[model samples]
Target: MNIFEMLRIDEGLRLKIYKDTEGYYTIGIGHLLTKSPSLNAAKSELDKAIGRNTNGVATKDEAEKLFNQDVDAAVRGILRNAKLKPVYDSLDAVRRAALINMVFQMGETGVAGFTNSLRMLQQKRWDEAAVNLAKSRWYNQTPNRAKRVITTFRTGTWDAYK
Candidate 1:
C-alpha cells in the first residue's frame, strides 16, 4: 500500500483529542496539536487546525488534512535533509518508505543518530543494518513497530505495521 494507507494503519485516526504516550495533545492519526504547549499554542495555531477551541475535536475531512500534512512533513524532512537525501534516493520504494516511517516516528535527527545503521544500509549489509537498529532505545520503547520497521528495511519488504 501507499504511505498514506500504511501510516493510517500504524496511526489510527482519532477525531477527539487525546494525550499521546509522550504526553502531547494529539488528534487525527498521530497528529500532535501541541507539544509542551503554552497558554496560546492551541488557542490559535492548533485550534485553527482542527477548527475547534479548548474542546478540540476533528471532523473526518479535518482528520484527512492533518494526516496529509503530517506525512508531507515527514517526506520533506527526509528529502530536504542533506545528509539523509542520498540514503533516501539510493533505496527502493519499499525501503524508501521505511525511511519515511522512521522519520515520521522519530525526527530526522533522531534517525540520524544511527550512523552505523545508515552506513550499513548504504553498504547493502541488511543483516548489519537490522542488528544496528535493534540495539537502541527506540527498539525497546516500541518493539512491535520497531521490529516491523527494521524487518522491512532489512528485507526490502513492507510489513505495513502488522
Candidate 2:
C-alpha cells in the first residue's frame, strides 16, 4: 500500500487542527484518542526531541512523525477487530483502505454497525455497498467524505477528495 497516499486520502494533505467527533485539543492526525499521547505529553516529548523549550503546539514535521506513528497504531487497531476480520480480509486494497479509514474515524464496533454495508462488501457487490455507505449515519454526518469513500469503493479510485 502507498502509505502516503492512504494518509492523504484519510487525513488530507495539510497539517491542521486535530479533533475527534467530540471537540478536544489534538495536534497530529487523529491522535487525540486515549491510545495516543495527550497534547501535554506530546509537547513534553517535542521539547525533548528538539532539545529546546516549546509550547504545546506541534510543528508540521513533528505532526508528520506523530501522524505516521499514530496511523500505524490505527491500522493495528483495525486488524484487531476480530469480528470484522473475515469481511475486512475479503476486500481489495481500496475497500480495505476505506475500512481502515472507517476504523480510524469510528471505532471497530462503530464500523461493525454497518451491517448492510458489510454484507454487501462480503458479497462483492460494489454498487450495493456504495449505496449502503451513502445511506449511513456516517454519510449524513460527513457527506463529502462519505461520497469519496463510496466512490473509491465503487471505482477503486481515490480522487473524490482531491
What's the lDDT for all of these models? 0.80, 0.69
- What candidate 1 gets wrong by more than 4 Å, as runs, is 37-45, 51-54, 160-162
Model 2 lDDT tens row, 85-140: 87878988777887777776777789888888888888889998898788878889
Error in Å for residue 14 of model 2? 6.7
Total clashing pairs in model 1: 0
Per-residue lDDT tens digits for candidate 1, residues 1-162, read 767777777778888777776677777888876776553554455588866563666688888988888889988988888878888888999888888888888889998778889888888899989999999999998888888888889888665454
Candidate 2 regions with alpha-carbon error over 4 angstroms: 1-3, 13-22, 33-54
RMSD (Å) per prediction: 2.1, 4.0
Best by TM-score: 1
Prediction-by-prediction clash tally:
0, 0
TM per prediction: 0.89, 0.75
In candidate 1 the C-alpha lDDT for residue 30 amounts to 84
